[PDB]
Design a protein around this ligand. Structure first.
Ligand code: ZN
Ligand code: ZN
Lengths: 224, 148, 108
Protein backbone atom coordinates (compact mmCIF):
# COMPACT_ATOMS: atom_id res chain seq x y z
CA UNK A 1 0.00 0.00 0.00
CA UNK A 2 1.07 3.58 -0.61
CA UNK A 3 0.62 4.41 3.08
CA UNK A 4 3.55 2.25 4.08
CA UNK A 5 5.69 3.57 1.24
CA UNK A 6 5.15 7.18 2.26
CA UNK A 7 5.95 6.15 5.82
CA UNK A 8 9.34 4.67 4.98
CA UNK A 9 10.18 7.54 2.66
CA UNK A 10 9.26 10.05 5.36
CA UNK A 11 11.73 8.26 7.61
CA UNK A 12 14.50 8.94 5.09
CA UNK A 13 13.94 12.69 5.44
CA UNK A 14 16.94 14.28 7.26
CA UNK A 15 14.94 16.51 9.60
CA UNK A 16 18.10 17.89 11.20
CA UNK A 17 19.19 19.46 7.93
CA UNK A 18 16.22 21.85 8.12
CA UNK A 19 16.52 22.32 11.91
CA UNK A 20 13.01 20.84 12.30
CA UNK A 21 11.48 24.03 10.90
CA UNK A 22 10.16 22.19 7.82
CA UNK A 23 7.85 19.19 8.12
CA UNK A 24 9.20 16.17 6.23
CA UNK A 25 8.30 16.20 2.54
CA UNK A 26 7.82 13.29 0.13
CA UNK A 27 7.52 13.66 -3.62
CA UNK A 28 4.79 11.76 -5.40
CA UNK A 29 7.33 10.40 -7.86
CA UNK A 30 9.15 8.67 -5.03
CA UNK A 31 5.86 7.08 -4.06
CA UNK A 32 5.80 5.69 -7.57
CA UNK A 33 9.25 4.21 -7.02
CA UNK A 34 8.27 1.85 -4.21
CA UNK A 35 4.83 1.13 -5.71
CA UNK A 36 5.32 0.18 -9.38
CA UNK A 37 1.57 0.12 -10.08
CA UNK A 38 1.35 3.82 -10.81
CA UNK A 39 -2.44 3.81 -11.04
CA UNK A 40 -2.97 2.02 -7.74
CA UNK A 41 -0.46 4.37 -6.12
CA UNK A 42 -2.44 7.38 -7.29
CA UNK A 43 -5.77 5.91 -6.22
CA UNK A 44 -4.51 5.11 -2.73
CA UNK A 45 -2.86 8.50 -2.34
CA UNK A 46 -6.17 10.10 -3.26
CA UNK A 47 -7.79 7.84 -0.68
CA UNK A 48 -5.41 9.05 2.02
CA UNK A 49 -5.76 12.70 1.03
CA UNK A 50 -9.54 12.47 1.26
CA UNK A 51 -9.24 10.92 4.71
CA UNK A 52 -7.22 13.96 5.80
CA UNK A 53 -4.02 12.28 6.95
CA UNK A 54 -1.84 14.01 4.35
CA UNK A 55 -1.69 17.20 2.34
CA UNK A 56 -0.46 17.62 -1.21
CA UNK A 57 1.34 20.85 -2.09
CA UNK A 58 2.38 22.21 -5.48
CA UNK A 59 6.11 22.68 -5.08
CA UNK A 60 6.27 24.55 -8.37
CA UNK A 61 9.85 23.73 -9.36
CA UNK A 62 8.33 21.32 -11.85
CA UNK A 63 4.74 21.28 -13.02
CA UNK A 64 4.60 17.62 -11.96
CA UNK A 65 6.07 18.33 -8.50
CA UNK A 66 3.53 17.52 -5.82
CA UNK A 67 4.97 17.25 -2.34
CA UNK A 68 3.28 14.96 0.17
CA UNK A 69 3.24 15.90 3.85
CA UNK A 70 1.50 14.38 6.84
CA UNK A 71 -1.17 16.81 7.97
CA UNK A 72 -0.04 16.70 11.59
CA UNK A 73 3.56 17.54 10.78
CA UNK A 74 2.19 20.46 8.75
CA UNK A 75 0.01 21.76 11.58
CA UNK A 76 2.67 21.26 14.24
CA UNK A 77 5.49 22.95 12.38
CA UNK A 78 3.38 25.82 11.05
CA UNK A 79 1.78 26.62 14.41
CA UNK A 80 5.05 26.32 16.31
CA UNK A 81 7.43 28.16 14.01
CA UNK A 82 5.04 30.74 12.55
CA UNK A 83 3.44 31.72 15.85
CA UNK A 84 6.84 31.81 17.58
CA UNK A 85 8.58 33.95 14.96
CA UNK A 86 5.36 35.99 14.62
CA UNK A 87 4.06 36.35 18.16
CA UNK A 88 2.41 39.76 17.93
CA UNK A 89 2.55 40.34 14.20
CA UNK A 90 -1.02 40.15 13.04
CA UNK A 91 -1.28 37.21 10.68
CA UNK A 92 -0.86 34.67 13.49
CA UNK A 93 -4.59 34.81 14.18
CA UNK A 94 -5.48 34.59 10.50
CA UNK A 95 -3.27 31.53 10.05
CA UNK A 96 -4.87 30.01 13.14
CA UNK A 97 -8.29 30.53 11.58
CA UNK A 98 -7.04 28.99 8.34
CA UNK A 99 -5.62 25.87 9.97
CA UNK A 100 -8.79 25.54 12.04
CA UNK A 101 -11.34 26.01 9.24
CA UNK A 102 -10.03 25.23 5.77
CA UNK A 103 -7.42 22.49 6.14
CA UNK A 104 -9.70 20.05 8.00
CA UNK A 105 -12.47 20.86 5.54
CA UNK A 106 -11.03 20.91 2.01
CA UNK A 107 -7.78 19.21 1.11
CA UNK A 108 -7.80 20.83 -2.31
CA UNK A 109 -4.50 21.78 -3.87
CA UNK A 110 -5.44 25.34 -4.93
CA UNK A 111 -7.53 28.00 -3.18
CA UNK A 112 -9.72 30.36 -5.19
CA UNK A 113 -10.78 33.76 -3.95
CA UNK A 114 -14.53 33.14 -3.94
CA UNK A 115 -14.21 30.21 -1.54
CA UNK A 116 -12.28 32.17 1.09
CA UNK A 117 -14.35 35.33 0.68
CA UNK A 118 -17.68 33.52 1.09
CA UNK A 119 -17.49 30.00 2.49
CA UNK A 120 -14.87 31.08 5.03
CA UNK A 121 -15.43 34.82 5.47
CA UNK A 122 -11.77 35.64 4.91
CA UNK A 123 -11.03 39.23 3.96
CA UNK A 124 -8.44 40.69 1.61
CA UNK A 125 -6.47 41.88 4.64
CA UNK A 126 -6.47 38.38 6.10
CA UNK A 127 -5.51 36.86 2.76
CA UNK A 128 -2.52 39.19 2.61
CA UNK A 129 -1.79 38.19 6.19
CA UNK A 130 -1.60 34.56 5.09
CA UNK A 131 0.42 35.36 1.97
CA UNK A 132 3.03 37.06 4.13
CA UNK A 133 2.90 34.09 6.48
CA UNK A 134 4.26 31.97 3.64
CA UNK A 135 1.11 29.86 3.84
CA UNK A 136 -0.24 30.97 0.45
CA UNK A 137 1.48 31.88 -2.80
CA UNK A 138 -0.04 33.42 -5.89
CA UNK A 139 -1.32 31.09 -8.59
CA UNK A 140 -3.23 33.83 -10.41
CA UNK A 141 -5.02 37.06 -9.61
CA UNK A 142 -7.21 35.99 -6.72
CA UNK A 143 -5.90 32.41 -6.79
CA UNK A 144 -3.29 30.94 -4.46
CA UNK A 145 -1.65 27.60 -3.81
CA UNK A 146 -1.26 26.07 -0.40
CA UNK A 147 2.36 26.21 0.75
CA UNK A 148 4.79 25.26 3.49
CA UNK A 149 6.73 28.20 4.95
CA UNK A 150 10.40 28.03 4.10
CA UNK A 151 10.09 25.45 1.34
CA UNK A 152 12.58 27.33 -0.83
CA UNK A 153 15.59 25.92 1.00
CA UNK A 154 14.37 22.36 0.49
CA UNK A 155 13.55 23.07 -3.13
CA UNK A 156 17.02 24.45 -3.84
CA UNK A 157 18.77 21.54 -2.16
CA UNK A 158 16.53 19.03 -3.91
CA UNK A 159 17.10 20.54 -7.33
CA UNK A 160 20.87 20.64 -6.99
CA UNK A 161 20.92 17.14 -5.52
CA UNK A 162 18.81 15.71 -8.31
CA UNK A 163 20.92 17.24 -11.04
CA UNK A 164 24.10 16.12 -9.28
CA UNK A 165 22.89 12.53 -9.01
CA UNK A 166 21.80 12.52 -12.64
CA UNK A 167 25.21 13.89 -13.58
CA UNK A 168 26.96 11.18 -11.57
CA UNK A 169 24.97 8.52 -13.42
CA UNK A 170 25.81 10.24 -16.70
CA UNK A 171 29.54 10.31 -15.99
CA UNK A 172 29.61 6.62 -15.11
CA UNK A 173 30.45 4.30 -17.98
CA UNK A 174 27.77 3.75 -20.65
CA UNK A 175 25.92 6.48 -18.82
CA UNK A 176 25.08 3.38 -16.74
CA UNK A 177 25.61 2.48 -13.10
CA UNK A 178 24.47 -0.18 -10.66
CA UNK A 179 22.21 0.97 -7.84
CA UNK A 180 24.33 -0.60 -5.11
CA UNK A 181 27.41 1.08 -6.55
CA UNK A 182 25.69 4.46 -6.45
CA UNK A 183 24.34 4.05 -2.92
CA UNK A 184 27.68 2.88 -1.52
CA UNK A 185 29.54 5.69 -3.27
CA UNK A 186 30.49 8.73 -1.23
CA UNK A 187 27.75 11.30 -1.67
CA UNK A 188 28.78 14.67 -3.15
CA UNK A 189 28.53 17.61 -0.78
CA UNK A 190 25.92 19.10 -3.11
CA UNK A 191 23.67 16.11 -2.37
CA UNK A 192 22.51 17.18 1.07
CA UNK A 193 19.34 15.07 1.42
CA UNK A 194 20.91 11.61 1.05
CA UNK A 195 21.30 9.42 -1.98
CA UNK A 196 18.47 6.93 -1.44
CA UNK A 197 16.01 9.82 -1.32
CA UNK A 198 17.14 11.24 -4.65
CA UNK A 199 17.49 7.82 -6.27
CA UNK A 200 13.88 6.98 -5.52
CA UNK A 201 12.84 10.29 -7.05
CA UNK A 202 14.82 9.68 -10.23
CA UNK A 203 13.50 6.14 -10.64
CA UNK A 204 9.91 7.19 -10.01
CA UNK A 205 9.92 9.93 -12.64
CA UNK A 206 11.36 7.61 -15.32
CA UNK A 207 14.38 9.88 -15.60
CA UNK A 208 16.59 6.79 -15.20
CA UNK A 209 15.97 3.33 -16.60
CA UNK A 210 15.77 0.59 -13.97
CA UNK A 211 17.19 -2.61 -15.48
CA UNK A 212 17.00 -5.69 -13.27
CA UNK A 213 20.24 -7.59 -13.89
CA UNK A 214 21.95 -10.58 -12.34
CA UNK A 215 24.05 -8.15 -10.28
CA UNK A 216 20.93 -6.18 -9.26
CA UNK A 217 19.01 -3.26 -10.66
CA UNK A 218 21.14 -1.21 -13.05
CA UNK A 219 20.53 2.47 -13.71
CA UNK A 220 20.74 3.48 -17.37
CA UNK A 221 19.91 6.83 -18.87
CA UNK A 222 17.17 6.51 -21.52
CA UNK A 223 18.48 7.65 -24.88
CA UNK A 224 17.66 11.32 -25.44
CA UNK B 1 33.73 -11.89 -17.47
CA UNK B 2 32.62 -8.32 -18.17
CA UNK B 3 35.84 -6.49 -17.25
CA UNK B 4 37.94 -8.06 -20.01
CA UNK B 5 35.38 -7.20 -22.69
CA UNK B 6 35.35 -3.54 -21.66
CA UNK B 7 39.14 -3.54 -21.54
CA UNK B 8 39.47 -5.04 -25.02
CA UNK B 9 37.01 -2.66 -26.65
CA UNK B 10 38.78 0.16 -24.83
CA UNK B 11 42.10 -0.68 -26.47
CA UNK B 12 40.44 -1.21 -29.85
CA UNK B 13 38.66 2.16 -29.71
CA UNK B 14 40.99 4.52 -27.85
CA UNK B 15 43.96 3.46 -29.98
CA UNK B 16 42.56 5.33 -32.96
CA UNK B 17 44.07 2.70 -35.22
CA UNK B 18 43.32 3.20 -38.93
CA UNK B 19 42.80 -0.58 -39.08
CA UNK B 20 41.71 -3.01 -36.37
CA UNK B 21 44.31 -5.16 -34.63
CA UNK B 22 43.38 -8.64 -35.92
CA UNK B 23 44.55 -10.75 -32.98
CA UNK B 24 42.50 -8.97 -30.33
CA UNK B 25 39.77 -8.65 -32.94
CA UNK B 26 39.70 -12.45 -33.11
CA UNK B 27 39.79 -12.62 -29.32
CA UNK B 28 36.74 -10.34 -29.26
CA UNK B 29 35.07 -12.49 -31.92
CA UNK B 30 35.58 -15.70 -29.95
CA UNK B 31 34.70 -14.20 -26.57
CA UNK B 32 31.51 -12.60 -27.94
CA UNK B 33 30.56 -15.86 -29.65
CA UNK B 34 30.66 -17.33 -26.13
CA UNK B 35 27.44 -15.65 -24.98
CA UNK B 36 24.55 -13.63 -26.38
CA UNK B 37 23.87 -11.37 -23.40
CA UNK B 38 27.58 -10.66 -23.65
CA UNK B 39 26.97 -9.84 -27.32
CA UNK B 40 24.39 -7.31 -26.14
CA UNK B 41 26.97 -6.02 -23.66
CA UNK B 42 29.41 -5.49 -26.53
CA UNK B 43 26.62 -3.76 -28.43
CA UNK B 44 26.07 -1.42 -25.49
CA UNK B 45 29.80 -0.73 -25.42
CA UNK B 46 29.69 0.19 -29.10
CA UNK B 47 26.66 2.46 -28.70
CA UNK B 48 28.24 4.23 -25.73
CA UNK B 49 31.51 4.72 -27.59
CA UNK B 50 29.76 6.06 -30.68
CA UNK B 51 28.23 8.96 -28.76
CA UNK B 52 31.66 10.00 -27.46
CA UNK B 53 33.04 13.05 -29.23
CA UNK B 54 35.76 11.85 -31.58
CA UNK B 55 35.52 10.89 -35.24
CA UNK B 56 38.24 8.23 -35.11
CA UNK B 57 36.67 6.58 -32.07
CA UNK B 58 33.33 6.53 -33.86
CA UNK B 59 35.02 5.02 -36.91
CA UNK B 60 36.46 2.23 -34.78
CA UNK B 61 33.12 1.58 -33.11
CA UNK B 62 31.29 1.52 -36.43
CA UNK B 63 33.84 -0.89 -37.89
CA UNK B 64 33.37 -3.23 -34.93
CA UNK B 65 29.60 -2.97 -35.38
CA UNK B 66 29.92 -3.86 -39.07
CA UNK B 67 32.04 -6.89 -38.21
CA UNK B 68 29.46 -8.15 -35.71
CA UNK B 69 26.59 -7.38 -38.08
CA UNK B 70 28.08 -9.41 -40.91
CA UNK B 71 29.07 -12.17 -38.48
CA UNK B 72 26.08 -12.39 -36.10
CA UNK B 73 22.33 -12.77 -36.65
CA UNK B 74 20.88 -11.74 -33.28
CA UNK B 75 23.13 -8.70 -33.48
CA UNK B 76 21.28 -7.78 -36.66
CA UNK B 77 17.91 -7.59 -34.92
CA UNK B 78 19.54 -5.79 -32.01
CA UNK B 79 21.07 -3.03 -34.15
CA UNK B 80 18.22 -2.66 -36.65
CA UNK B 81 16.08 -2.03 -33.57
CA UNK B 82 17.76 1.38 -33.15
CA UNK B 83 18.87 1.81 -36.76
CA UNK B 84 17.34 5.28 -36.52
CA UNK B 85 19.79 6.50 -33.87
CA UNK B 86 22.62 4.48 -35.38
CA UNK B 87 22.23 6.23 -38.74
CA UNK B 88 21.86 9.55 -36.93
CA UNK B 89 25.17 9.14 -35.12
CA UNK B 90 27.09 7.71 -38.09
CA UNK B 91 25.67 9.53 -41.11
CA UNK B 92 25.19 12.79 -39.23
CA UNK B 93 21.79 13.16 -40.86
CA UNK B 94 20.59 15.54 -38.16
CA UNK B 95 22.63 18.74 -38.65
CA UNK B 96 22.00 19.47 -34.97
CA UNK B 97 24.33 16.54 -34.16
CA UNK B 98 27.28 16.73 -36.57
CA UNK B 99 30.25 14.37 -36.61
CA UNK B 100 33.14 15.38 -34.27
CA UNK B 101 36.66 16.01 -35.59
CA UNK B 102 38.99 15.17 -37.19
CA UNK B 103 37.57 15.91 -40.63
CA UNK B 104 39.46 13.05 -42.29
CA UNK B 105 38.03 10.57 -39.80
CA UNK B 106 34.54 12.01 -40.33
CA UNK B 107 34.82 11.63 -44.11
CA UNK B 108 36.17 8.09 -43.78
CA UNK B 109 33.27 7.28 -41.47
CA UNK B 110 30.84 8.75 -44.00
CA UNK B 111 32.23 6.72 -46.89
CA UNK B 112 32.49 3.51 -44.88
CA UNK B 113 28.96 3.76 -43.49
CA UNK B 114 27.52 4.53 -46.93
CA UNK B 115 29.20 1.43 -48.31
CA UNK B 116 28.20 -0.68 -45.32
CA UNK B 117 24.57 0.37 -45.67
CA UNK B 118 24.67 -0.49 -49.36
CA UNK B 119 26.11 -3.92 -48.64
CA UNK B 120 23.62 -4.60 -45.88
CA UNK B 121 20.74 -3.65 -48.16
CA UNK B 122 22.09 -6.06 -50.75
CA UNK B 123 22.54 -8.87 -48.23
CA UNK B 124 20.04 -8.73 -45.34
CA UNK B 125 17.67 -6.08 -46.71
CA UNK B 126 14.83 -8.49 -47.43
CA UNK B 127 15.48 -10.15 -44.08
CA UNK B 128 14.93 -6.85 -42.22
CA UNK B 129 12.25 -4.66 -43.76
CA UNK B 130 13.34 -1.76 -41.57
CA UNK B 131 16.77 -1.88 -43.23
CA UNK B 132 15.20 -1.52 -46.66
CA UNK B 133 13.11 1.39 -45.40
CA UNK B 134 16.18 3.05 -43.94
CA UNK B 135 18.12 2.61 -47.17
CA UNK B 136 15.32 4.18 -49.19
CA UNK B 137 14.93 6.96 -46.63
CA UNK B 138 18.62 7.80 -46.84
CA UNK B 139 18.58 7.63 -50.62
CA UNK B 140 15.72 10.11 -51.11
CA UNK B 141 14.94 12.16 -48.00
CA UNK B 142 18.62 12.79 -47.25
CA UNK B 143 19.84 12.24 -50.84
CA UNK B 144 23.03 10.50 -49.73
CA UNK B 145 25.42 10.00 -52.65
CA UNK B 146 25.94 6.24 -52.72
CA UNK B 147 28.23 6.58 -55.76
CA UNK B 148 30.75 8.77 -53.89
CA UNK C 1 78.87 53.80 -36.29
CA UNK C 2 82.46 52.89 -35.43
CA UNK C 3 82.57 50.13 -32.82
CA UNK C 4 81.89 46.63 -34.13
CA UNK C 5 80.12 43.68 -32.53
CA UNK C 6 83.36 41.68 -32.81
CA UNK C 7 81.94 38.74 -30.88
CA UNK C 8 83.59 35.33 -31.44
CA UNK C 9 81.52 33.61 -34.11
CA UNK C 10 81.35 29.80 -34.29
CA UNK C 11 83.41 29.96 -37.50
CA UNK C 12 86.30 31.67 -35.69
CA UNK C 13 85.56 35.06 -37.27
CA UNK C 14 84.73 38.19 -35.29
CA UNK C 15 81.49 40.01 -35.99
CA UNK C 16 81.72 43.07 -38.24
CA UNK C 17 78.13 44.22 -37.64
CA UNK C 18 77.80 48.01 -37.30
CA UNK C 19 75.02 48.36 -34.73
CA UNK C 20 74.89 51.46 -32.55
CA UNK C 21 73.75 49.69 -29.38
CA UNK C 22 73.21 45.91 -29.54
CA UNK C 23 74.17 43.01 -31.76
CA UNK C 24 71.04 41.06 -32.79
CA UNK C 25 73.12 37.89 -32.50
CA UNK C 26 75.35 38.71 -29.49
CA UNK C 27 73.08 40.83 -27.29
CA UNK C 28 74.53 44.03 -25.88
CA UNK C 29 77.59 45.37 -27.68
CA UNK C 30 80.62 45.74 -25.40
CA UNK C 31 84.04 47.00 -26.54
CA UNK C 32 86.19 44.09 -27.69
CA UNK C 33 89.86 43.82 -28.55
CA UNK C 34 91.25 42.59 -31.88
CA UNK C 35 90.75 38.98 -30.73
CA UNK C 36 87.23 39.52 -29.41
CA UNK C 37 87.77 39.52 -25.66
CA UNK C 38 85.82 42.39 -24.04
CA UNK C 39 88.22 45.01 -22.71
CA UNK C 40 86.41 45.21 -19.38
CA UNK C 41 87.05 42.08 -17.26
CA UNK C 42 83.70 42.61 -15.52
CA UNK C 43 81.91 42.75 -18.87
CA UNK C 44 83.70 39.54 -19.87
CA UNK C 45 82.58 37.87 -16.64
CA UNK C 46 78.99 38.98 -17.22
CA UNK C 47 79.08 37.70 -20.81
CA UNK C 48 80.51 34.37 -19.64
CA UNK C 49 77.77 34.07 -17.00
CA UNK C 50 75.10 34.83 -19.60
CA UNK C 51 76.58 32.26 -21.99
CA UNK C 52 76.68 29.64 -19.23
CA UNK C 53 73.05 30.37 -18.34
CA UNK C 54 72.03 30.07 -21.99
CA UNK C 55 73.92 26.78 -22.36
CA UNK C 56 72.31 25.38 -19.21
CA UNK C 57 68.86 26.42 -20.44
CA UNK C 58 44.59 8.65 -27.98
CA UNK C 59 48.06 9.45 -29.32
CA UNK C 60 47.42 7.79 -32.69
CA UNK C 61 44.60 10.27 -33.31
CA UNK C 62 45.07 13.90 -34.30
CA UNK C 63 45.08 16.53 -31.56
CA UNK C 64 43.04 19.66 -32.23
CA UNK C 65 45.46 21.63 -30.04
CA UNK C 66 48.10 21.23 -32.77
CA UNK C 67 46.37 23.86 -34.90
CA UNK C 68 45.50 25.93 -31.82
CA UNK C 69 49.10 25.57 -30.61
CA UNK C 70 51.01 27.09 -33.52
CA UNK C 71 52.54 30.45 -34.37
CA UNK C 72 50.04 31.21 -37.11
CA UNK C 73 47.07 30.65 -34.82
CA UNK C 74 48.65 32.87 -32.17
CA UNK C 75 49.29 35.70 -34.61
CA UNK C 76 45.79 35.39 -36.02
CA UNK C 77 44.36 35.59 -32.52
CA UNK C 78 46.38 38.71 -31.78
CA UNK C 79 45.69 40.63 -34.99
CA UNK C 80 42.04 39.60 -35.42
CA UNK C 81 40.99 40.96 -32.05
CA UNK C 82 38.20 43.50 -31.74
CA UNK C 83 40.50 45.92 -29.92
CA UNK C 84 43.22 45.57 -32.56
CA UNK C 85 40.87 46.15 -35.48
CA UNK C 86 39.39 49.11 -33.63
CA UNK C 87 42.82 50.72 -33.24
CA UNK C 88 43.57 50.02 -36.90
CA UNK C 89 40.31 51.67 -37.93
CA UNK C 90 41.05 54.66 -35.68
CA UNK C 91 44.51 55.18 -37.18
CA UNK C 92 43.17 54.86 -40.72
CA UNK C 93 40.45 57.40 -39.88
CA UNK C 94 43.17 59.82 -38.71
CA UNK C 95 44.85 59.23 -42.06
CA UNK C 96 41.49 60.25 -43.53
CA UNK C 97 41.64 63.32 -41.29
CA UNK C 98 44.86 64.37 -43.02
CA UNK C 99 43.47 63.88 -46.51
CA UNK C 100 40.56 65.99 -45.27
CA UNK C 101 43.22 68.60 -44.42
CA UNK C 102 44.21 68.69 -48.13
CA UNK C 103 42.04 71.79 -48.80
CA UNK C 104 43.65 74.84 -47.19
CA UNK C 105 43.06 78.03 -49.17
CA UNK C 106 39.60 77.46 -50.67
CA UNK C 107 36.26 76.86 -48.98
CA UNK C 108 37.12 73.23 -48.15
ZN1 ZN D 1 77.47 40.30 -34.00
ZN1 ZN E 1 75.82 38.46 -32.77
Amino acid sequence: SARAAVSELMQLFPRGLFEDALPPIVLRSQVYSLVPDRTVADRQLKELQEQGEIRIVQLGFDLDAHGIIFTEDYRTRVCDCVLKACDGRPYAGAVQKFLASVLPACGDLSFQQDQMTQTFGFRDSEITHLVNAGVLTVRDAGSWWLAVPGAGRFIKYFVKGRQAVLSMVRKAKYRELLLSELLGRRAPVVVRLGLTYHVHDLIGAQLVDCISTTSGTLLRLPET
Amino acid sequence: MDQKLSKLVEELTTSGEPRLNPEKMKELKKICKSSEEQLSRAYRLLIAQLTQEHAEIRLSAFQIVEELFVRSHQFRMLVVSNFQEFLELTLGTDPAQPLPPPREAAQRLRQATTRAVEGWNEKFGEAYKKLALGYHFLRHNKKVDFQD
Amino acid sequence: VQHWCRAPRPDGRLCERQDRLKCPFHGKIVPRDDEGRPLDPEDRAREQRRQLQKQERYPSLTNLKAQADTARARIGRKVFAKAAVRRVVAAMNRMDQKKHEKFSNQFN
